[PDB]
Enzyme design. Sequence first.
Site, mmCIF file in Angstrom:
data_model
loop_
_atom_site.group_PDB
_atom_site.id
_atom_site.type_symbol
_atom_site.label_atom_id
_atom_site.label_comp_id
_atom_site.label_asym_id
_atom_site.label_seq_id
_atom_site.Cartn_x
_atom_site.Cartn_y
_atom_site.Cartn_z
ATOM 1 N N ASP A 25 0.835 -1.213 0.000
ATOM 2 C CA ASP A 25 0.000 0.000 0.000
ATOM 3 C C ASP A 25 0.860 1.249 0.000
ATOM 4 O O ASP A 25 1.264 1.775 1.038
ATOM 5 C CB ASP A 25 -0.862 -0.049 1.255
ATOM 6 C CG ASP A 25 -1.868 1.044 1.328
ATOM 7 O OD1 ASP A 25 -1.891 1.893 0.418
ATOM 8 O OD2 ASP A 25 -2.628 1.076 2.317
ATOM 9 N N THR A 26 1.159 1.778 -1.192
ATOM 10 C CA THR A 26 1.994 2.969 -1.297
ATOM 11 C C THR A 26 1.335 4.220 -0.727
ATOM 12 O O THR A 26 2.015 5.207 -0.463
ATOM 13 C CB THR A 26 2.451 3.231 -2.746
ATOM 14 O OG1 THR A 26 1.306 3.410 -3.570
ATOM 15 C CG2 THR A 26 3.290 2.123 -3.291
ATOM 16 N N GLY A 27 0.019 4.192 -0.583
ATOM 17 C CA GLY A 27 -0.695 5.302 0.005
ATOM 18 C C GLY A 27 -0.746 5.293 1.516
ATOM 19 O O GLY A 27 -1.352 6.193 2.121
HETATM 20 C C1 LIG Z 1 -9.112 5.253 -0.788
HETATM 21 C C2 LIG Z 1 -10.043 4.051 -0.514
HETATM 22 C C3 LIG Z 1 -10.943 3.788 -1.726
HETATM 23 C C4 LIG Z 1 -9.204 2.818 -0.190
HETATM 24 N N1 LIG Z 1 -10.007 1.610 0.042
HETATM 25 C C5 LIG Z 1 -10.043 0.566 -0.798
HETATM 26 O O1 LIG Z 1 -9.435 0.545 -1.867
HETATM 27 C C6 LIG Z 1 -10.901 -0.655 -0.444
HETATM 28 O O2 LIG Z 1 -11.643 -0.317 0.764
HETATM 29 C C7 LIG Z 1 -12.127 -1.336 1.530
HETATM 30 C C8 LIG Z 1 -12.877 -0.992 2.659
HETATM 31 C C9 LIG Z 1 -13.401 -1.970 3.503
HETATM 32 C C10 LIG Z 1 -13.167 -3.309 3.207
HETATM 33 C C11 LIG Z 1 -12.415 -3.665 2.086
HETATM 34 C C12 LIG Z 1 -11.890 -2.678 1.243
HETATM 35 C C13 LIG Z 1 -8.299 3.019 1.041
HETATM 36 O O3 LIG Z 1 -8.742 3.522 2.090
HETATM 37 N N2 LIG Z 1 -7.038 2.584 0.860
HETATM 38 C C14 LIG Z 1 -6.059 2.633 1.975
HETATM 39 C C15 LIG Z 1 -5.635 1.210 2.342
HETATM 40 C C16 LIG Z 1 -6.850 0.363 2.689
HETATM 41 C C17 LIG Z 1 -7.437 0.520 3.951
HETATM 42 C C18 LIG Z 1 -8.546 -0.248 4.298
HETATM 43 C C19 LIG Z 1 -9.076 -1.145 3.370
HETATM 44 C C20 LIG Z 1 -8.482 -1.303 2.113
HETATM 45 C C21 LIG Z 1 -7.362 -0.548 1.780
HETATM 46 C C22 LIG Z 1 -4.881 3.519 1.646
HETATM 47 O O4 LIG Z 1 -4.212 3.070 0.457
HETATM 48 C C23 LIG Z 1 -5.363 4.948 1.641
HETATM 49 N N3 LIG Z 1 -5.908 5.360 0.329
HETATM 50 C C24 LIG Z 1 -4.239 5.831 2.069
HETATM 51 O O5 LIG Z 1 -3.909 5.534 3.471
HETATM 52 C C25 LIG Z 1 -4.570 7.283 1.676
HETATM 53 C C26 LIG Z 1 -4.811 8.226 2.815
HETATM 54 C C27 LIG Z 1 -3.710 8.855 3.387
HETATM 55 C C28 LIG Z 1 -3.891 9.752 4.441
HETATM 56 C C29 LIG Z 1 -5.180 10.020 4.900
HETATM 57 C C30 LIG Z 1 -6.282 9.400 4.304
HETATM 58 C C31 LIG Z 1 -6.109 8.510 3.248
#
Ligand SMILES: CC(C)[C@H](NC(=O)COc1ccccc1)C(=O)N[C@@H](Cc1ccccc1)[C@@H](O)[C@H](N)[C@H](O)Cc1ccccc1
EC number: 3.4.23.16
Lengths: 99, 99
Positions: A25-27
């Site tokens: 997870d690069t984010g």
């Molecule tokens: C962006 C979302 C569509 C993404 N989620 C997903 O891609 C899939 O989400 C789910 C949720 C529940 C169950 C299964 C899958 C996500 O949260 N992605 C996150 C990882 C993730 C968390 C929880 C579930 C799945 C993925 C990160 O990659 C996230 N985008 C980063 O931390 C970015 C960030 C940095 C700083 C502050 C706020 C956000």
Amino acid sequence: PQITLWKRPLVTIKIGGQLKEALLDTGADDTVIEEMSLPGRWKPKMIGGIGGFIKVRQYDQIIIEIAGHKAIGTVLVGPTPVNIIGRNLLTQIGATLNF
Amino acid sequence: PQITLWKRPLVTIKIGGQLKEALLDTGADDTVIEEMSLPGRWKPKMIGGIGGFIKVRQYDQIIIEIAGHKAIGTVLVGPTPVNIIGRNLLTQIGATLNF
Ligand SMILES: CC(C)[C@H](NC(=O)COc1ccccc1)C(=O)N[C@@H](Cc1ccccc1)[C@@H](O)[C@H](N)[C@H](O)Cc1ccccc1
């Protein structure tokens, strides 16, 4: 390896001697693993994601294997929806994004 | 290009005639952009991750340039804390993870 992104970049990890699956997870700044029993000392911490903030247990200096590659660093343990390997450990395994 | 992960992998994007900074996020299924007044029809959606869910507007066939690479696809717009380029668009620009 080189990993494309048509599917989620899920890999096998070994943590505390147990196999789990986790998302590269690069984010994510940090590595966050679902609730588990984990050997080592911890302290309470809060982290934020897309939907708000949660409470986790912060474990420093944890030995973990990610797709066969060794890292030793901070692992946060708490009610994350998916196990995530964030930049703190991706940098240890030498991961980069390329396009 | 190659982007290391010592710091957040932020790049310049162009969307809706505006330049923004966004995070290349292998852990995101979807692309989520800060509130902006994109034209045309959209569909309500909720997306989640750590912390819970947020409500977003789903826009399809949105033209977007990511670090100079053209792409076209679904973009979700709403109160995200960071602009996120997810796998739906990372695949279009040929991005991989490598270690
Ligand atoms: C962006 C979302 C569509 C993404 N989620 C997903 O891609 C899939 O989400 C789910 C949720 C529940 C169950 C299964 C899958 C996500 O949260 N992605 C996150 C990882 C993730 C968390 C929880 C579930 C799945 C993925 C990160 O990659 C996230 N985008 C980063 O931390 C970015 C960030 C940095 C700083 C502050 C706020 C956000």
